Amino acid sequence: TIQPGTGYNNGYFYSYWNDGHGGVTYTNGPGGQFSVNWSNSGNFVGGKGWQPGTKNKVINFSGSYNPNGNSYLSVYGWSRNPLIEYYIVENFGTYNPSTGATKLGEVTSDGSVYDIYRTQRVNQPSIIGTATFYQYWSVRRNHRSSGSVNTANHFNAWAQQGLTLGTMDYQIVAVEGYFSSGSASITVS
């Protein structure tokens, strides 16, 4: 059981953030494993992966994901110059995070069609401070809690549609929750 922050565990980068509200337990396991157990949480994000990520990484993830409420399971990360927060969403609970966003295409990868969206965050927290920046989304139609993500298929499809990325920062498989309950146990490689 760990307290929010970032570091390296068993060769993997991890990041665990929460808004202080309580009701979240995050645990680093051996190798690429992490667990998240939450009950009437606030907002939180936690996972394992790489710092920095790359534009041609094939990310594998295996485990179980049981949300009760608003939660996502994603390949999640940032780029710099331009500043971009991006999500490849594999599963989610009661809220589809692309709701109300602008659809910018479709890409087929790793056994499913994904829908592509762009949203804008105005004067929100970021890896370089309060900023205004775009978010890019790929949302998998056929939900799953295990699989392989070929990131290059998404990054290239985004670029075709005008959604360009800069220099990669961290790149993790992440469980995100917003005032919900659930359990997840995921192993990354």
Q: Residue 28: which of 50, 51, 10 has the closest Cα?
A: 10
Among all chains, which residue has been given the structure tokens 């990868």? Answer: 109
Indicate if 176 belongs to the active site: yes
Alpha-helical runs (H) found in the chain: 151-160
Q: Which amino acid is at 160?
A: Q
Q: Residue 171: which of 75, 71, 95, 103 has the closest Cα?
A: 75
Q: Residue 74: which of 125, 130, 149 has the closest Cα?
A: 149
Which of 75, 85, 90, 187 is labelled catalytic?
Answer: 85
Q: Residue 72: which of 167, 163, 172, 170 has the closest Cα?
A: 172
Q: Which amino acid is at 68?
A: N
Domains of the chain: 1-189 (2.60.120.180)
Question: Distance between CA atoms of 47 and 54, rounded to whole angstroms?
Answer: 17
Question: Distance between CA atoms of 18 and 22, rounded to whole angstroms?
Answer: 8
Provide the experimental method for this PDB entry: neutron
- 13's tokens: 């980068």
* Residue list, annotated binding site for substrate: 72, 76, 87, 121, 125, 135, 170
Residue 106's CB is within 10 A of a number of other CB atoms, namely 13
DSSP classification of residue 111: T
Which of 79, 172, 176, 177 is labelled catalytic?
Answer: 176
Question: Distance between CA atoms of 48 and 37, rounded to whole angstroms?
Answer: 15
Question: Distance between CA atoms of 117 and 135, rounded to whole angstroms?
Answer: 8
Q: How many residues appear in the chain?
A: 189
Question: Distance between CA atoms of 181 and 65, rounded to whole angstroms?
Answer: 11
Indicate if 85 belongs to the active site: yes
Residue 130's CB is within 10 A of a number of other CB atoms, namely 9
Among all chains, which residue has been given the structure tokens 């309580």? Answer: 22
For the chain, strand residue ranges (E) read 5-9, 12-18, 24-28, 33-38, 43-50, 58-68, 71-80, 84-92, 102-109, 112-124, 131-140, 147-150, 167-178, 181-188
List, in order, residues 6 or more apart from 100 with CB less than 8 Å away: none
Angle, CA 145 vertex, CA 142 and CA 149 arms, to 5°: 75
Question: Distance between CA atoms of 127 and 137, rounded to whole angstroms?
Answer: 18
* Residue list, annotated binding site: 72, 76, 87, 121, 125, 135, 170
On the question of a cis peptide bond just before residue 4, with omega within 30 degrees of 0, the verdict is: no
- 27's tokens: 């645990």
The per-residue DSSP string of 60-99 comes to EEEEEEEEESSEEEEEEEEEETTTEEEEEEEEESS--TTT
